[PDB]
């Protein structure tokens, strides 16, 4: 399908309820005469930014919210205009996930998180810890089964383990995700990835396992557990496997932390059907009946629409989804997310296949991601940002016992209490600084900034700020 005025083309991932969505499309056509074509191309999230400029995109694209900041920076999304009454129908935190630089850039549909799914006939009590899986697999192999199979090809599925003991994508500091502060190669990420690679080393899992392989093995009853989202429940229902959905195992006593996605619908900037797309999304899809149709095809998870979520919340499988979601973290939607995922994808694949050691693979991923992020800001921009901060300090200085404000060439010091150590967060406007650190001065009992013995120098300690250099 190609875009045409007076009809709608919608893209959604092949794991989602595209047939349920087409039923919503059918009702839209019945009512309005506007034909709706739903497609599920492979790699649609990469394809969209490639083909939009040629006029080969959809009118509406569905994906988890994490990709949308990138699309918005590239000018590929139309602005959406839900009035206040409409916005009030959805949970505020679902709107937050689709807010980029203060604008709503897509409609939220549903909250997704991975859970542990287990076969109750093979395993009545699911393991509480990752650590106990190796012995569980040993026991099951003897009966011609395996403990656990999940998609190892996509970092989304391995992340919850990587994050458990301390891995993170970007640090949130000073009211934003700090792209200088990337947590892909710290001790926590390395611990989690090592545990995974050890499972492979010890033949508890196979490095080649992908989504379809894992799904079939669980649904055929060949493996005791899988890790998957709410969309997978339908096929399990069909297979008649006796299954439960539960909290992911802990690692080193800590919860697994899945990255939480809000499935969202954005409108192509190049669509001549923006008003029809709005009508479809607000008045047909985002209704009790619209979401039920999609949900009955493949479960959406916790829907963004409050009225319908209030029903679905009583489902124990949704209760488990929300439990894992709260233990996890909502994904950033910043443009840097695709580069983050690429780096982790490569790191996991390389570690799992033995191409690299765990430490090499994550160091490389961290290095390559950071190389890209650290190239954004020019010297000229960085000078401009410091100059702005200087002009602010000079304002504060003009408006002036405690120590007094002064400019030290990088930061404006505040008042300091007599005889005290003064700590100032490492300034946000210095791109390369560590922003979870503080710079330090000492204030005299006499209300003068402490000097360096045998110098006219003022003492300051910026060692925490320079952590990354």
């Amino acid at each position: 399908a190609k875009i045409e005025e007076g009809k709608l083309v919608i893209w959604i991932n092949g794991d989602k309820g595209y047939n349920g969505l087409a039923e919503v499309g059918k009702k839209f056509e019945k009512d309005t005469g506007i034909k709706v074509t739903v497609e599920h191309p492979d790699k649609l999230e990469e394809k969209f930014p490639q083909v939009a400029a040629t006029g080969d995109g959809p009118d509406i694209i569905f994906w988890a919210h994490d990709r949308f900041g990138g699309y918005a920076q590239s000018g590929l999304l139309a602005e959406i205009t839900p009035d206040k009454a409409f916005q009030d129908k959805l949970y505020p935190f679902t709107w937050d996930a689709v807010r980029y630089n203060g604008k709503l850039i897509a409609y939220p549909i549903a909250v997704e998180a991975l859970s542990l799914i287990y076969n109750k006939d093979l395993l009545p009590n699911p393991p509480k810890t990752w650590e106990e899986i190796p012995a569980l697999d040993k026991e099951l192999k003897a009966k011609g089964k395996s403990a656990l199979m999940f998609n190892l090809q996509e970092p989304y599925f391995t992340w919850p383990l990587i994050a458990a003991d301390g891995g993170y994508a970007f640090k949130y500091e000073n009211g934003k995700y700090d792209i200088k502060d990337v947590g892909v190669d710290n001790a926590g990420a390395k611990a989690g990835l090592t545990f995974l690679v050890d499972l492979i080393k010890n033949k508890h899992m196979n490095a080649d396992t992908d989504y379809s392989i894992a799904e079939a093995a669980f649904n055929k009853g060949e493996t005791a557990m899988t890790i998957n989202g709410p969309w997978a429940w339908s096929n399990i229902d069909t297979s008649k496997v006796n299954y439960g959905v539960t909290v992911l195992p802990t690692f080193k006593g800590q919860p697994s932390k899945p990255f939480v996605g809000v499935l969202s619908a954005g409108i192509n900037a190049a669509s001549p059907n923006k008003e029809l797309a709005k009508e479809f999304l607000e008045n047909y899809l985002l209704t009790d009946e619209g979401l039920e149709a999609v949900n009955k095809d493949k479960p959406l998870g916790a829907v963004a629409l409050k009225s319908y979520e209030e029903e679905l919340a009583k489902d124990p499988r949704i209760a488990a989804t929300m439990e894992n979601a709260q233990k996890g973290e909502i994904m950033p939607n910043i443009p840097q997310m695709s580069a983050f995922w690429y780096a982790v994808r490569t790191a996991v694949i390389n570690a799992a296949s033995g191409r690299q050691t765990v430490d090499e693979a994550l160091k490389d991923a961290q290095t390559n991601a950071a190389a890209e992020f650290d190239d954004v800001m020019t010297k000229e921009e960085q000078i401009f940002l410091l100059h702005r901060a200087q002009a602010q300090c000079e304002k504060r200085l003009k408006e002036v016992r405690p120590c007094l404000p002064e400019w030290d060439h990088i930061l404006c010091w505040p008042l300091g209490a007599p005889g005290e150590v003064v700590a100032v967060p490492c300034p946000d406007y210095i791109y390369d600084f560590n922003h979870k650190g503080h710079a330090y001065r000492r204030c005299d009992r006499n209300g003068s900034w402490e000097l360096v013995p045998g110098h006219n120098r003022t003492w300051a300690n910026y060692s925490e700020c320079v952590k990354f250099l």
Binding site: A371, T378, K379, D408, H409, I410, T458, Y462, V466
Partner: peptide
């Protein structure tokens, strides 16, 4: 490229701070 230029500038800025 940008990163090298920017960090180099900051090291010189960190040094003005030290001299202050």
């Amino acid at each position: 490229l940008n990163s090298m230029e920017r960090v180099e500038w900051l090291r010189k800025k960190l040094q003005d701070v030290h001299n202050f």
